[PDB]
């Protein structure tokens, strides 16, 4: 047990104290971030301010060569858990929130020997949303885009593995039932400019249950 | 060689980070622009209005310039706003602490120019009387440095039209107009000027 703990600490020291440290992605060294949403609850829909509050898990996956190691050199360690604060993480942001995001869970990432990082924080988000129609059979539709705050498509590529938001954990006695929830990669082009900008558009349709 | 790009960037960053703010001898121009996303709330019982916007800030430091040739042709980089000096531009008539809605990350280019565009929610003093009418309500808030006069920080806008192209189309309030105007204030006590940018929003339900 003690030999493995020593290997884990020497590995984490080596990675976190690397000599070319990781400054985030560049055009020469771009990065792909995969995003998935697990929607748990629409807590509140406020028609006096047109804000809606979502609780979800936001799964984030990316991979760095500088987080790669050979397990044989570290006592067959294939992965470790680490506070998200100790590694680089991407700057993926809701583009139309109305309040700072509230974190509902530990912020702990899993790093694997091939350099993959997985990170799933639980969050509560308020964002711009007109709930008109929520008391009808058609329901209400709202959308929020997620993307990098400072990186174009040439530095951060954004992907989803599925366009279907995972609703298998949606709260069954929520004040609002989900009619549909999609997460779709979108490419924005601006006339002025050659590089594209990637967002993932979260579209949720819902009505009073 | 992807490691060599990373090596050049880390070298450059640690080099630059290893500036006390402006003085009358070394003054600084800060350019300011607003992109108004949404009027979230107008409270007529306390006369506060809540705004969500992006505040674009741009300035240029000679101490942040570098020759790309010495650094693998790196022409710019991203950095946490906390690792560099940032201006103290403040709303003068807020009623609550600013809430930051976005990462705080700036882009530095090889000529020493910096760009920083944080998203923010601001409560500020505003009487929304008339917001339920055709004329609408008019409110205003000034932004400026907290400790520097016009001789140390000069404040500028590239236009006096607030960018309303991302204004939330289903907001409870529609925008009639929105302007960002440089004001120069003179006090009779004092030879130095004081500069603010006045944000005036005309809006209705």
């Amino acid at each position: 047990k003690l030999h493995s703990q020593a290997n884990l600490m020497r590995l984490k020291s080596d990675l976190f104290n690397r000599s070319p440290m990781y400054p985030g992605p560049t055009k020469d060294d771009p990065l792909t971030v995969t995003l998935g949403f697990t929607l748990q609850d629409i807590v509140k829909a406020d028609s006096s301010t047109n804000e809606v509050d979502l609780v979800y898990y936001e799964q984030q996956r990316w991979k760095l060569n500088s987080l790669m190691w050979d397990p044989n050199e570290y006592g067959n360690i294939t992965d470790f858990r680490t506070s998200a604060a100790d590694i680089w993480t991407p700057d993926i942001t809701a583009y139309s929130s109305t309040r700072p995001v509230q974190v509902l869970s530990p912020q702990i990432a899993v790093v694997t020997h091939d350099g993959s990082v997985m990170f799933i924080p639980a969050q509560r988000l308020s964002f711009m949303c007109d709930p008109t129609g929520v008391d009808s059979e058609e329901g209400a539709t709202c959308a929020v885009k997620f993307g990098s705050w400072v990186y174009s498509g040439f530095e951060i590529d954004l992907k989803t593995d599925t366009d279907q938001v995972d609703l298998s954990s949606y709260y069954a006695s929520s004040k609002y039932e989900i009619l549909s929830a999609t997460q779709t990669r979108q490419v924005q082009h601006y006339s002025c400019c050659p590089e594209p900008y990637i967002d993932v558009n979260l579209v949720v349709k819902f009505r009073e249950r | 060689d992807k490691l060599h790009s990373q090596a050049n960037l880390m070298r450059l960053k640690s080099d630059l980070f290893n500036y006390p703010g402006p003085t009358k001898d070394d003054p600084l121009t800060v350019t300011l622009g607003f992109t108004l996303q949404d009027i979230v709330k107008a409270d007529s019982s306390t006369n506060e209005v809540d705004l969500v916007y992006y505040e674009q800030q741009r300035w240029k430091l000679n101490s942040l310039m570098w020759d790309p040739n010495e650094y693998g042709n790196i022409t710019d980089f991203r950095t946490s706003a906390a690792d560099i000096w940032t201006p103290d531009i403040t709303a003068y008539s807020s009623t609550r602490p600013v809430q930051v809605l976005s990462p705080q990350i700036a882009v530095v280019t090889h000529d020493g120019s910096v760009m920083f565009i944080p998203a923010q929610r601001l409560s500020f003093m505003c009487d929304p009387t008339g917001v339920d009418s055709e004329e609408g309500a008019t409110c205003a808030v000034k932004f400026g440095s907290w400790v520097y006069s016009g001789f140390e920080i000069d404040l500028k806008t590239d236009t006096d039209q607030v960018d309303l192209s991302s204004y939330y189309a289903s907001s409870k309030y529609e925008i009639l107009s929105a302007t960002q105007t440089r004001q120069v204030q003179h006090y009779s006590c004092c030879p130095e000027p004081y500069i603010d940018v006045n944000l005036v929003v005309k809006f209705r339900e």
Binding site: - | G33, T35, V107, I117
Partner: peptide
């Protein structure tokens, strides 16, 4: 357009 997108604006000082 580009000026209203913060990732685009910060990459184009010359226009935004």
């Amino acid at each position: 357009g580009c000026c209203s997108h913060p990732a685009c604006s910060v990459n184009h000082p010359e226009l935004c």
